[PDB]
């Protein structure tokens, strides 16, 4: 289970946005670290209302399950704070935040090799999950965290991590799932119980599309009703302007879940380009 963190050791600072049934804040945690040194550590605070019991259970069970699998490409969770009326996930603060807004702010100065390298790391994180038969269920560019930027000089690549899974689409309202087309796969719109490892292959493809599109949101011009009709007419996303990954995207966004390629096969495809 998660280590418990006292409210008196947490300082809440600025709001870093809102999620569906979660609030996000930058904060500070006071802690005794290695060798007994006192630290004040920047933390990311994800906050759920204790009154949303089924949402909180799904969120924190998902965070717990992924945190049992330590890995360089999976976000680090320090623990949970439960002292008041809120369940709080106390998470590592990533310097550059979520990839979707980073892409929008830097689209002009991000070339194909930066995108290829990010795709390979994300696929490596998903292969590790696939080998452990653990479903993430909410892969998107907003759930990629950028630890470190590319070093233009010393040829250092960027480095990313995958954020915690969050509330399962098996317990969310159907209208939120519909709004999350085309990240949510067509078989889960049909029935959220079809959530399966194949789900993360579809969403991975949607996430590559985000990565290659400077952080545009695919199908954002379509309201929920037309988003459904998109899946009904078996359409595929348009090739991004930088289209080098378009074939891979469409191969991943296969309407037959059993046909979506393994992440081992995705990695080999990525290495060939
Ligand atoms: N650990 C960490 N460190 C930092 N540092 C940081 C540094 C600078 C800046 S900045 N840009 O202000 O300067 C900002 C942050 N950020 N961080 C996070 O974890 N952020 C974070 C925030 C929201 C999310 C997130 C992702 C997906 C979500 O839904 C699923 C979904 C699926 C498909 C389609 C839609 C939605 C939701 C939700 O709806 O609940 C929330 C993830 C990560």
Swiss-Prot record:
Breakpoint for translocation to form PCM1-JAK2 fusion protein, annotated site positions: 175-176
Post-translational modification: Autophosphorylated, leading to regulate its activity. Also phosphorylated by TEC. Phosphorylated on tyrosine residues in response to interferon gamma signaling. Phosphorylated on tyrosine residues in response to a signaling cascade that is activated by increased cellular retinol. Undergoes Notch-induced ubiquitination and subsequent proteasomal degradation which is mediated by ASB1 or ASB2, the substrate-recognition components of probable ECS E3 ubiquitin-protein ligase complexes.
One GO biological process term: positive regulation of interleukin-1 beta production
Keyword terms of this UniProt record: Adaptive immunity, ATP-binding, Chromatin regulator, Chromosomal rearrangement, Cytoplasm, Disease variant, Immunity, Innate immunity, Kinase, Magnesium, Membrane, Metal-binding, Nucleotide-binding, Nucleus, Phosphoprotein, Proto-oncogene, Repeat, SH2 domain, Transferase, Tyrosine-protein kinase, Ubl conjugation
GO terms for cellular component: caveola; cytoplasm; cytoplasmic side of plasma membrane; cytoskeleton; cytosol; endosome lumen; euchromatin; extrinsic component of cytoplasmic side of plasma membrane
Record domain Protein kinase: where: 10-273
Single Gene Ontology MF annotation: type 1 angiotensin receptor binding
Entry keyword Transcription: no
Tissues where this protein is expressed: Ubiquitously expressed throughout most tissues.
Subcellular location: Endomembrane system; Cytoplasm; Nucleus
Keyword Ion transport listed: no
Modified residues (Phosphotyrosine): 35
Outcome of swapping residue 4 to L: In myeloproliferative disorder with erythrocytosis; requires 2 nucleotide substitutions
Record text on subunit structure and interactions: Interacts with EPOR, LYN, SIRPA, SH2B1 and TEC. Interacts with IL23R. Interacts with SKB1. Interacts with STAM2. Interacts with IFNGR2 (via intracellular domain). Interacts with LEPR (Isoform B). Interacts with HSP90AB1; promotes functional activation in a heat shock-dependent manner. Interacts with STRA6. Interacts with RHEX; this interaction occurs in a erythropoietin (EPO)-dependent manner. Interacts with ASB2; the interaction targets JAK2 for Notch-induced proteasomal degradation. Interacts with MPL/TPOR.
Protein family membership: Belongs to the protein kinase superfamily. Tyr protein kinase family. JAK subfamily.
Disease link: Chromosomal aberrations involving JAK2 are found in both chronic and acute forms of eosinophilic, lymphoblastic and myeloid leukemia. Translocation t(8;9)(p22;p24) with PCM1 links the protein kinase domain of JAK2 to the major portion of PCM1. Translocation t(9;12)(p24;p13) with ETV6. Budd-Chiari syndrome: A syndrome caused by obstruction of hepatic venous outflow involving either the hepatic veins or the terminal segment of the inferior vena cava. Obstructions are generally caused by thrombosis and lead to hepatic congestion and ischemic necrosis. Clinical manifestations observed in the majority of patients include hepatomegaly, right upper quadrant pain and abdominal ascites.
Domain characteristics, as noted in the entry: Possesses 2 protein kinase domains. The second one probably contains the catalytic domain, while the presence of slight differences suggest a different role for protein kinase 1.
Main function: Non-receptor tyrosine kinase involved in various processes such as cell growth, development, differentiation or histone modifications. Mediates essential signaling events in both innate and adaptive immunity. In the cytoplasm, plays a pivotal role in signal transduction via its association with type I receptors such as growth hormone (GHR), prolactin (PRLR), leptin (LEPR), erythropoietin (EPOR), thrombopoietin receptor (MPL/TPOR); or type II receptors including IFN-alpha, IFN-beta, IFN-gamma and multiple interleukins.
Protein name (database record): Tyrosine-protein kinase JAK2
Part of the whole protein covered: 536 to 808 of 1132
